[PDB]
Every structure is written in C-alpha cells, then in structure tokens.
A paper describes a structure:
In addition to the catalytic His mutants, near-complete catalytic inactivation is evident also in T232A, T311A, F235A, F235L, and Y168A. The inactivation by the T232A and T311A mutations was expected: threonine or serine is found in the catalytic motif in all 2H phosphoesterases, and in CNPcat, they are involved in all stages of catalysis, in achieving the correct substrate binding mode together with His230, His309, and the active-site water network.
2′,3′-cyclic nucleotide 3′-phosphodiesterase (CNPase) comprises 4% of total myelin protein in the central nervous system (CNS), being the most abundant CNS non-compact myelin protein4. CNPase consists of an N-terminal polynucleotide kinase-like domain10, a catalytic phosphodiesterase domain11, and a membrane-anchored C-terminal tail, which contains a cysteine residue that undergoes isoprenylation. The catalytic domain enables the rapid hydrolysis of nucleoside 2′,3′-cyclic phosphates to nucleoside 2′-phosphates. The CNPase catalytic site, lying in a groove between two lobes, has pseudo two-fold symmetry and contains two apposing His-X-Thr-X (X denotes a hydrophobic residue) motifs, characteristic for 2H phosphoesterases 113537.
Residue numbers in the entry: 161 to 208, 212 to 378
The structure:
C-alpha cells in the first residue's frame, strides 16, 4: 500500500486572515456593483432600469477558511503530482507558517478572486513546467497564484486562476488602460469583456500555513 497525496497542496489562511480578506472581497463587490463605471458595462457582464448584486452573483463561495493553491495533485492521479511531493522544499515547508501578499482584487463574469504575489521562498513551493499552459505564456511563475473568493453558478474551480492569468496577460500588453475610478483601497481598472481589477494602494498581508487538503 503506497501513500496517496492530498487533493492539493497550498497555503491555508488562518481564521482571522480569512475573515479579513473575505470581508474586503465582499466590500469590493458591493462597491463595484454600485460604481457607475460597472453599471455602464453590465451588458458585457450578463446578456439578460435596475441593478445587479455581485455578492448574489457569486453564490458559490468558500464556506470558511480561504487558501492559495500551489499544486493540484488529485491524490497523485494528476500529472507531476508525485514529482512535486518528493521535493525536499515541499516536505520541509509542510506545516510551516507563511505571509502571503495580496496585491489586487479582480472580478470577471465567471470568477471573483485576489491576486497573490509570492516571495522567492514561496515560489520554491510553486510547481514548475512539465506541461506549461497557454494561459500563463509570457508571464512569470506564480502569476496564477490566487485566492478564490467567488464563482458564478456554472463556473468550474479551475477558472479563477485562468481568469487571473487572462487579466494579467492584458496588463502585460498594456491594455490595462487608465483608472476609471477610485475605491478607498485603490484604483479601479476596466479591462473590457466584463473584467475588473482593483489595484490595492496598500498590499494586504495575510497569514497562512502551507499544508495539504484531502477533501
């Protein structure tokens, strides 16, 4: 009997760090939905005189504690899941505390989440390229690093990281555009196709422990 891996490795925010980011995320959706910049472009958001509530729009949310996923392993069935688990840094970091840096919150017609900017030490726990996806092409590793805050009814969990990457691909091209508004936390940007990003004036710091989830 070999030992199977967790469902996925990642940094799991503490109760207070979760609550803090969880509230700020909720606030952001309430601010965006009220913002006039967003109300003009509801057409790009949903196909169907009145107003949308984004907290309700993102019904599928994390029940309790939040987290930043590193490697999806699926108990080893996923490719590269085993090679990642043998890494001394993964073994050495298992159960240790880390401080993740949130640089921005984002919203799409599919997902709501937060951008994570990992340190080098934390990037060593980031899985590398055996198959390298199309979405993260040209972007440095860990660009996908995120914390899922909300998903639309028919959106899959993988979509959050892809939505973050997609938004970051536009910023690289310089299609970020000028800020269309100013929220108390930072500048609001409209990237088109229902994509919205809040660039935090102050990098929010969260406290988490690197471990594995089993379902």
């Amino acid at each position: 009997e070999k030992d199977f891996l967790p469902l996925y490795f990642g940094w799991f925010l503490t109760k207070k760090s979760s609550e803090t980011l969880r509230k700020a995320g909720q606030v952001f959706l309430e601010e965006l939905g009220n913002h006039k910049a967003f109300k003009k472009e509801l057409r790009h958001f949903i196909s169907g005189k009145e107003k949308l509530e984004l907290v309700s729009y993102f019904g599928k949310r994390p029940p309790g504690v939040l987290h930043c996923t590193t490697k999806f392993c699926d108990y080893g069935k996923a490719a590269g899941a085993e090679e990642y688990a043998q890494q001394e840094v993964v073994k050495r970091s298992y159960g240790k505390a880390f401080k993740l840096s949130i640089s921005a919150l984002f919203v799409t017609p599919k997902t709501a989440g937060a951008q994570v900017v990992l340190t080098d030490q934390e990037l060593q726990l980031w899985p590398s390229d055996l198959d390298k996806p199309s979405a993260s092409e040209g972007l440095p590793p860990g660009s996908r690093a995120h914390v899922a805050l909300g998903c639309a009814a028919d959106v899959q969990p993988v979509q959050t990281g892809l939505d973050l990457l997609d938004i970051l691909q536009q910023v690289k091209g310089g299609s970020q555009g000028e800020a269309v508004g100013e929220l108390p936390r930072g500048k609001l940007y409209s990237l088109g196709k229902g994509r919205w990003m809040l660039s935090l004036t102050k990098k929010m710091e969260v406290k988490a422990i690197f471990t594995g989830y089993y379902g």
